[PDB]
Design a binder for this molecule. Structure first.
Ligand code: CLA
Ligand code: CLA
Ligand code: CLA
Ligand code: CLA
Ligand code: CLA
Ligand code: CLA
Ligand code: CLA
Ligand code: CLA
Ligand SMILES: CCCCCCCCCCCCCCCC(=O)OC[C@H](COP(=O)(O)OC[C@@H](O)CO)OC(=O)CCCCCCCCCCCCCCC
Ligand SMILES: CC1=C(C/C=C(\C)CCC[C@H](C)CCC[C@H](C)CCCC(C)C)C(=O)c2ccccc2C1=O
Ligand code: SF4
Ligand code: SF4
Ligand code: SF4
Lengths: 141, 68, 138, 39, 80, 73, 739, 49, 73
């Protein structure tokens, strides 16, 4: 319920501080736009937006929409980095392709990473994502 | 095992235990470790600050599992 | 031990009280010409022509100079003999122990420290917990 | 010119090319759309 | 005095003896490798323990080992 | 203040020394033959999965906890 | 004497795309991640790349040209930011009210708050480099003149880039051209320094002196005549200086006292600006110019007259020193590292001399009342000069490992230094223990006695006094120097020795600096910490080849980790590791020097001036009673004066608040590399390699932990990056706040 | 001439015969100090120390 | 209060990570498969094999003491 978190539209600490919001960019109304945007959040006793991350879809834009947007991009960086590393491993000189990146091969993989979650599920089902424990270098216990 | 045969190192003390290697030569002279195995990953070997290790080690028949 | 000392002006890196109380080390080599060698104590000394007798504090100092006699000189002095000198007058011939340099295999040498197994086939420390002996020992 | 293409495709240059382009995205997105604490 | 042990994975390329600065190691005849020689350690009383032999060993894991044991004047590398 | 800080600093010593003697256990007193396939051997068996996931959790926590503090600074 | 080789190295990009080609062990390609780090460590090690000294010296000459192109671009950037993004025209109208600023930040993510009000409506980063004070002393009036220097800096940088390519790929000089050191010293004393000082004395007389005399008279910067107008029309020039109309005839007929109106030995400071008189500096530079052009005729090159530097070194032998300086000429004409060790030692000493001279004789107008500029310029040139002194101990030890030949080094000074290594070091070891107990233990006695409520038992001015009587006598001799031992000097060399208090804008330019018990103790602290930094680096040079521990360290190299755990442990025995330990002690030495500087200026020099002549200081004279104790250094210096860096958030100085915490982090990040070691980290990576092998994302370039030297190199880099950035943000936020 | 030589003839003992360590004045002062004076019993040379 | 528990969680997990890796690699590792032969507390195995600074299981007690104090700090 967050009884100790008043909304920022009815928070007197935020209302006395939103009129003195500074401009972060060259726009002279940057502090006014931030005052209207942060009014919909939940504020504490010091009039700053406290974010709720527990899983409520009312506060889905606090963490879940950052979570969905991050994991897509971070999955994209990991998947095209993994797929480039697999492709250059089959070449004559796999070592030199890491310090001297085959840039046309890199752009080909990086634009193909928009369908990484469908490619990750399919490669997990095919067994080419996860290696078996018998086929991996192992410490001597 | 012939030259070019792919083996997996079952010798636990080695750097390549669980890694795949390629048989380079087998010595027919009664050697305790007659099978020379070449690897694509060098080991830790060398002084501190060295950019590479050694990719070759001699093994016996009991320490190799057939892969290819 | 016979040999003239190399012409050296003296140094503070040389022998200490251990040389005349516990042990000191002597290196004896025959020089072809009057050359300049780096002392392991710091500084440059000049070889006397013929036999040379140099007293050093450690066996490592005699062998660092002996390594310098092998590879840093064009005539390639390869007959240096290294002795351990005791204060009781005992002179013990150390290197080479059989007259042949140890990187060359020699007949009559006996295997010391050789183990007829791998390092990974050493016994566990739990099986010899109260015996004194190490896993590499027994 | 071919080795100039190889030098421009080296690991220091391409990570400085990408991070400049990544900072080029993020600064410009926070210039036209600043102050985004949440969605 | 330290313990210098040589195991049967020796290939006999004599690199431990050439890296030895204290004349601890030497090559004895042997029948277990192609070079027909194994390193031995008859002079571990002069062993300082600096492990230059283990750096020079090319086999995997190590065909020569130095185990640091009791410290004497010789093994502590003291000129005094 | 003195009572809380004393008991936490003592408990920090006791926790690290617990894993320290946990490591003296594997060095000295551990038998892989008698502990074959039990819960102690299997901790050694997937020790690479244990260390890398603890390395993941520490990096997952530390990149963000410092990252949110440096953001807030 | 000129001997070049026609096109030795072809110009192509084939080696640009093949990294590691310069080293034989890196040309085979990477196998581990150590190859990437070895690519950067060995990139400029030209002696390790090439055994030919001629090809080594050719790489060195062209790398100098490329380095000068970097400095000229950096110089051009400072003049371009002064021309385009600065209030220099605004500052030139009101130097006492407008703060200097030459960096404007873009408005993004709230960082536009750093564009503080520096006066006149301008908003930007308040600069502390002193460039505005330098340009006013150069006569810079309009921003177009700063812009033309910025274009000319890029032209000079392009010519530095062209001459680097020309002298490596087209016409590279031979080894005999490089080894003609008598020609090089004749062309650098009489050339670079002598004509450069003569050119600047010509600039100062014709440009700097008339413009600054009019700017101090009250003439607006719009109404100043241009520098070429003084050259073209000498009627304005003779109006400012009446004996200028006699022309060059009093110069050639030795009637030099005609020029005494603009070539003065005034001394002291200009009361209008607080800087040195440009009549003094032009007469300084001309007297400097005559001496180096005279001194650049000392050495014999082609025409018979002159000195052979070999024959000077051959003659200087004594009874204590054997053969003397014999063979040092062959050392310094064959070893580049031996010359670099001398040049880093003296340039590092020179930059410390520059810092120690520029605060007490401030050479620029309105510099001495900018307490931020005075604190920054002292601190920057202390840190630069201390880093170079550590590099002297580096390339001293690199020469001993690599280029020391004992065949041509028998019984000379370098042979005999090696022969009594235990005599030098153990006495240097003793004098560090004596100074450490008798400077720091004085503080510990003071810290204990003040804690026990015994102020009479302390070492202070109200207790057991330790007066620096020899420095007070030298200070007294300098105050009595005008009229007695410098009779033609109207004022003292500096008011730091004693005498007048100079006020410019209601702020002290310079006061007498009275040295008491606190100044005695902190100078012996400085004498202690310099001696340890000398102890670590001299032992690194002397014991680079051998010791009683490891007698074959010359074969091991200059930069090696150790010789194993044997002999108890030979950890950090290399000459590199003494540079590694010397960098910490240089940080420890210089941080106390700039802390002694920052406290003694604010407590006993800097402050505001009452109209009747009274001076109140920034920290109200707390150096005499609190700089005798570690707690006073903790409380009244560190805790009190960092209130400005921690309350700076939400203001223009909040970037200093960010960077003060930023350096605290990199300090703590260093101790991961310093305290730990790579066999933990290699054992940690190989579990992360397993999780990459689990998902088939293990790289072909095998991930390795850093080498032992690189683990020390990263840790000493972050410790000194973290520590200096902390002090930089502490000094800059405090000294912009005060005044 | 040359006032620094080998200490007592041997150049491989780690010491040097210097004007501080092995001068004529040094040997007649150090050797005539109580701890080194010839013929003194330890009770008198302890007493004078 | 939220951020500092995650610093505490970072402090506990990283201190556990050094300690568990010290315990699980106490018998050996790929850099040193004979750490049980060398005991719990040994300096190193020389600068060979790339360098083996602080490779012992005692040296992970050493490193986690800093992290335990940092967590307790
Ligand atoms: C650490 C414990 C924990 C974790 C792992 C979760 C996890 C989650 N919470 Mg949650 N929550 C928690 C405790 C927890 N919560 C607590 C203590 C509260 C405060 C009262 C809530 C309040 C909360 C609400 C009210 C909602 C979530 C919901 C969600 C789900 C996210 C929606 C989705 O697509 O999931 C896949 C997921 C199951 C949402 C959901 O879908 O519920 C089923 C939802 O509406 N949670
Ligand atoms: C763990 C990493 C972390 C997280 C989760 C965020 C997340 C965010 N940062 Mg950031 N920030 C961080 C690290 C972090 N930061 C650090 C390391 C710094 C110091 C360099 C900053 C300094 C910073 C500033 C100064 C700004 C952001 C802003 C933001 C927002 C980005 C909106 C966008 O571009 O779309 C978002 C709330 C912007 C924002 O909208 O703030 C709410 C903004 O102005 N960040
Ligand atoms: C302002 C945004 C911000 C910033 C600057 C970072 C920055 C980073 N995060 Mg992070 N994170 C954020 C928001 C942010 N995060 C949010 C909103 C979430 C909640 C979902 C997370 C959750 C998250 C995860 C789950 C992980 C990261 C990771 C990373 C680090 C490595 C980069 C990476 O994974 O890409 C390169 C990509 C890869 C190497 C492949 C990783 C696979 C991704 C995570 C998809 C996995 C799907 C399940 C990097 C320091 C990693 C980390 O902390 O290191 C341990 C990681 O595991 N973060
Ligand atoms: C402020 C100090 C500090 C920092 C941040 C680190 C950082 C870390 N420690 Mg620790 N460590 C420290 C001091 C510190 N430590 C000291 C004093 C010791 C005692 C010797 C150790 C002992 C130690 C051990 C023994 C272990 C750690 C581990 C690690 C990781 C912990 C997981 C984590 O938080 O990662 C996430 C957070 C970070 C990496 C911090 C972010 C760093 C920067 C700010 C962001 C990166 C971008 C950067 C700016 C790019 C550089 C560009 C620049 C060149 C211009 C990480 C590398 C463990 C590890 O590596 O396992 C995973 C490990 O086993 N450390
Ligand atoms: C006139 C200056 C001068 C010159 C000509 C050289 C020349 C050289 N030095 Mg150096 N030296 C000097 C000053 C100088 N030095 C000083 C000031 C120091 C004290 C620190 C030393 C200490 C020293 C040592 C300790 C070593 C050398 C060595 C080298 C050689 C190769 C360097 C190389 O390739 O690594 C290039 C490597 C780098 C450029 C990486 C350094 C990066 C630093 C740590 C961080 C940069 C600081 C930066 C401002 C902070 C921001 C970082 C980031 C945010 C961007 C070469 C002969 C090496 C050698 O073996 O000699 C034969 C070596 O081991 N020198
Ligand atoms: C565009 C013309 C050009 C090209 C194609 C070459 C080509 C060659 N030169 Mg080079 N050279 C040039 C101009 C050029 N040079 C100039 C301008 C200089 C003066 C510094 C020299 C001086 C010189 C030296 C002293 C050496 C070479 C050598 C080399 C070879 C390899 C260089 C390498 O590894 O590159 C890859 C590396 C880089 C491209 C460096 C990247 C930039 C670094 C960080 C330096 C940046 C500072 C820069 C000089 C000035 C900054 C400009 C300013 C505007 C910011 C190759 C045959 C080397 C060799 O092995 O010859 C046998 C050798 O020792 N040259
Ligand atoms: C009067 C003649 C003259 C002058 C002006 C200089 C000046 C210079 N020489 Mg040079 N030198 C000369 C003749 C001269 N030399 C002769 C005859 C010899 C042969 C015996 C050399 C041999 C030589 C070597 C081998 C080196 C120098 C270097 C340099 C620079 C010194 C350091 C520096 O950056 O200065 C400050 C720079 C300036 C004030 C900029 C001056 C702009 C132009 C050059 C005027 C400087 C550009 C070093 C250098 O940096 O190479 C580029 C270098 O490696 N010189
Ligand atoms: C490298 C420095 C240098 C340069 C190029 C100049 C340039 C100039 N000087 Mg000179 N000047 C200089 C150093 C220099 N000076 C110094 C150091 C002194 C002190 C001895 C003077 C004192 C001086 C006087 C007193 C006069 C000049 C004058 C002149 C001009 C006439 C020169 C000629 O031969 O006709 C010329 C523009 C004359 C002139 O007309 O100036 C405008 C003149 O009256 N100069
Ligand atoms: C006064 C002390 C002084 O510096 O004398 C300097 C003294 C001068 O020796 P020489 O007369 O041999 O010097 C000839 C010089 O040209 C150096 O080669 O040299 C030493 O005794 C060095 C030892 C100083 C150690 C203290
Ligand atoms: C953490 C640590 C490691 C692990 C560190 C490693 C393996 C290096 C990590 C390097 C990362 C991948 C990049 C470092 C940051 C770069 C300098 C950033 C470059 C610029 C970017 C924008 C690309 C050691 O190897 C080590 C060795 C010896 C003593 C102490 C330590 C030690 O403390
Ligand atoms: S540690 Fe050194 S002295 Fe001992 S056996 Fe090995 S190489 Fe020889
Ligand atoms: S122990 Fe290693 S270095 Fe010595 S002979 Fe055997 S293989 Fe060669
Ligand atoms: S650096 Fe590491 S391996 Fe080398 S001596 Fe020191 S502790 Fe041993």
């Amino acid at each position: 319920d967050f009884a100790n978190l008043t909304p920022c539209s009815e928070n007197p600490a935020y209302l006395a501080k939103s009129k003195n919001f500074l401009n972060t960019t060259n726009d002279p109304n940057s502090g006014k736009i931030r005052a209207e945007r942060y009014a919909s959040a939940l504020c504490g006793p010091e009039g700053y937006p406290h974010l709720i991350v527990d899983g409520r879809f009312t506060h889905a834009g606090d963490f879940l929409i950052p979570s969905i947007l991050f994991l897509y991009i971070a999955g994209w960086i990991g998947w095209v980095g993994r797929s480039y590393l697999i492709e250059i491993r089959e070449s004559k000189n796999p070592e030199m392709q890491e310090v001297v990146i085959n840039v046309p091969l890199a752009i080909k993989k990086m634009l193909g990473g928009f369908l990484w979650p469908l490619a990750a599920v399919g490669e997990y089902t095919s067994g080419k994502l996860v290696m078996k424990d018998s086929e991996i270098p192992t410490s001597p216990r | 095992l012939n030259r070019g045969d792919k083996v997996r190192i079952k010798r636990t003390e080695s750097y390549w235990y669980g890694d795949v290697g390629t048989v380079a030569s087998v010595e027919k002279s009664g050697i305790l470790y007659p099978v020379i195995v070449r690897f694509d990953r060098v080991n830790y070997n060398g002084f501190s600050g060295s950019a590479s290790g050694v990719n070759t080690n001699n093994f016996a028949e009991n320490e190799l599992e057939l892969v290819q | 031990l016979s040999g003239q000392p190399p012409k050296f002006g003296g140094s503070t890196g040389g022998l200490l009280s251990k040389a005349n109380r516990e042990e000191k080390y002597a290196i004896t080599w025959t020089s072809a010409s009057e050359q300049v060698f780096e002392m392991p104590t710091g500084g440059a000394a000049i070889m006397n022509e013929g036999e040379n007798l140099l007293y050093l504090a450690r066996k490592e100092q005699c062998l660092a100079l002996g390594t310098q006699l092998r590879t840093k000189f064009k005539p390639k002095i390869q007959d240096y003999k290294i002795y351990r000198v005791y204060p009781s007058g005992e002179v013990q011939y150390l290197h080479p122990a059989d007259g042949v340099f140890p990187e060359k295999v020699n007949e009559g040498r006996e295997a010391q420290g050789t183990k007829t197994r791998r390092i990974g086939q050493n016994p566990e420390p739990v099986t010899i917990k109260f015996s004194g002996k190490a896993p590499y020992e027994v | 010119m071919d080795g100039l293409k190889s030098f421009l495709s080296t690991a220091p240059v391409m990570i400085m090319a990408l991070l400049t382009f990544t900072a080029g995205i993020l600064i410009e997105f926070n210039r036209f759309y600043p102050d985004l604490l949440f969605h | 005095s330290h313990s210098v042990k040589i195991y049967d994975t020796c290939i006999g390329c004599t690199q431990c003896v050439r890296a030895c600065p204290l004349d601890v190691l030497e090559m004895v005849p042997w029948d277990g490798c192609k070079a027909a020689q194994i390193a031995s350690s008859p002079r571990t009383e002069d062993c300082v323990g600096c492990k230059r032999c283990e750096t020079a060993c090319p086999t995997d894991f190590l065909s020569i080992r130095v185990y640091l044991g009791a410290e004497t004047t010789r093994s502590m590398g003291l000129a005094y | 203040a003195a009572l809380y800080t004393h008991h936490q600093y003592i408990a920090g010593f006791l926790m690290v020394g617990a894993f320290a003697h946990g490591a003296i256990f594997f060095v000295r007193d551990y038998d892989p033959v008698a502990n074959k396939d039990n819960v102690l051997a299997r901790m050694l068996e997937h020790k690479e999965a244990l260390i890398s996931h603890l390395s993941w959790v520490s990096l997952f926590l530390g990149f963000h906890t410092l990252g949110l503090y440096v953001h807030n600074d | 004497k000129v001997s070049v080789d026609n096109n030795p190295v072809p110009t192509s990009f084939e080696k640009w795309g093949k990294p590691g080609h310069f080293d034989r062990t890196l040309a085979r390609g990477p196998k581990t991640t150590t190859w990437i780090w070895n690519l950067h460590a060995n990139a400029h090690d030209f002696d390790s790349q090439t055994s030919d000294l001629e090809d080594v010296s050719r790489k060195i000459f062209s790398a100098h040209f490329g380095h000068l192109a970097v400095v000229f671009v950096w110089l051009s950037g400072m003049y371009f930011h002064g021309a385009k993004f600065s209030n220099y025209e605004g500052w030139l109208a009101d130097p006492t009210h407008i703060k200097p600023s030459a960096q404007v930040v873009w408005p993004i993510v709230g960082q536009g708050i750093l564009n503080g009000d520096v006066g006149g409506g301008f908003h930007g980063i308040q600069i502390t480099s002193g460039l505005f004070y330098l340009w006013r002393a150069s006569g810079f009036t309009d921003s177009y003149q700063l812009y033309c220097t910025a274009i000319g800096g890029l032209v000079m940088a392009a010519l530095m880039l062209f001459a680097g390519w020309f002298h490596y790929h087209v016409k590279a000089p031979k080894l005999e051209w490089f080894q003609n050191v008598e020609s090089m010293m004749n062309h650098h004393l009489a050339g670079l320094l002598g004509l450069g000082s003569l050119g600047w004395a010509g600039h100062q007389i014709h440009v700097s002196m008339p413009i600054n005399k009019l700017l101090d008279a009250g003439v607006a910067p719009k109404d100043i005549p241009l520098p070429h107008e003084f050259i073209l029309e000498p009627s304005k020039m003779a109006e400012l200086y009446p004996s200028f109309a006699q022309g060059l005839t009093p110069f050639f007929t030795l009637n030099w006292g005609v020029y005494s109106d603009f070539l003065t030995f005034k001394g002291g400071l200009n009361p209008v600006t607080g800087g040195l008189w440009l009549s003094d500096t032009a007469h300084h530079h001309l007297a400097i110019a005559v001496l180096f052009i005279i001194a650049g005729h000392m050495y014999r090159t082609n025409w018979g007259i002159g000195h052979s530097m070999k024959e000077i070194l051959e003659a200087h032998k004594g009874p204590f020193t054997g053969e003397g300086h014999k063979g040092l000429y062959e050392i310094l004409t064959t070893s580049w590292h031996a010359q670099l060790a001398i040049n880093l030692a003296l340039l590092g000493s020179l930059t410390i001399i520059v810092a120690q001279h520029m605060y007490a004789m401030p050479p620029y107008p309105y510099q001495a009342i900018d307490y931020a500029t005075q604190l920054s310029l002292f601190t920057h040139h202390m840190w630069i000069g201390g880093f170079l002194i550590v590099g002297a101990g580096a390339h001293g030890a690199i020469f001993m490992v690599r280029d020391y030949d004992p065949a041509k080094n028998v019984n000379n000074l370098l042979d005999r230094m090696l022969r009594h290594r235990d005599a030098i070091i153990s006495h240097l070891n003793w004098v560090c223990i004596f100074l450490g107990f008798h400077s720091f233990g004085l503080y510990i006695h003071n810290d204990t006695m003040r804690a026990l409520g015994r102020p009479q038992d302390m070492f202070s001015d109200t207790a057991i006094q330790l007066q620096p009587i020899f420095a007070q006598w030298v200070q007294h001799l300098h105050t009595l120097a005008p009229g007695a031992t410098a009779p033609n000097a109207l004022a003292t060399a500096s008011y730091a020795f004693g005498g007048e208090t100079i006020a410019v804008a209601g702020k002290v330019a310079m006061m007498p600096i009275t040295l008491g018990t606190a100044d005695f103790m902190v100078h012996h602290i400085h004498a202690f910490t310099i001696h340890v930094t000398a102890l670590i680096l001299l032992k690194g040079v002397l014991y680079a080849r051998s010791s009683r521990l490891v007698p074959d360290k010359a074969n091991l190299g200059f930069r090696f980790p150790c010789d194993g755990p044997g002999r108890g442990g030979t950890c950090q025995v290399s000459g590199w590791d003494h540079v590694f330990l010397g960098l910490f002690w240089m940080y420890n030495s210089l941080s106390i020097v700039i802390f002694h500087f920052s406290w003694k200026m604010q407590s006993d020099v800097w402050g505001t001036v009452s109209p009747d002549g009274s001076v109140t200081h920034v920290t109200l004279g707390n150096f005499a009673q609190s700089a005798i104790t570690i707690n006073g250094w903790l409380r009244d210096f560190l805790w009190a004066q960092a209130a400005n860096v921690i309350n700076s958030y939400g203001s223009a100085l909040s970037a200093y608040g960010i960077m003060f915490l930023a350096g605290h982090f990199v300090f703590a990040f260093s101790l991961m590399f310093l305290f730990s070691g790579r066999g933990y980290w290699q054992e940690l990576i190989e579990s992360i390699v397993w999780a990459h092998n689990k998902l088939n994302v293990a790289p072909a370039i095998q991930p390795r932990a850093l080498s032992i030297i690189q683990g020390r190199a990263v840790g000493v880099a972050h410790y000194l990056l973290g520590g200096i950035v902390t002090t930089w943000a502490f000094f800059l936020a405090r000294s912009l706040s005060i005044g | 001439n040359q006032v620094v030589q080998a200490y007592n003839g041997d150049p491989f003992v780690g010491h040097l015969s210097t004007p501080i360590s092995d001068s004529a004045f040094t040997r007649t002062f150090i050797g005539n100090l109580p701890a080194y004076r010839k013929g003194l019993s330890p009770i008198l040379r302890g007493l004078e120390v | 209060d939220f951020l500092v528990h995650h610093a505490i969680a970072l402090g506990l997990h990283t201190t556990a990570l050094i300690l568990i890796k010290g315990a699980l690699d106490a018998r050996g590792s790929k850099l040193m498969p004979d750490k049980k032969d060398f005991g719990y507390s040994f300096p190193c195995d020389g600068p060979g094999r790339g360098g083996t600074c602080d490779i012992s299981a005692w040296d992970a007690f050493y490193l986690a003491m800093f992290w335990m104090l940092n967590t307790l700090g």
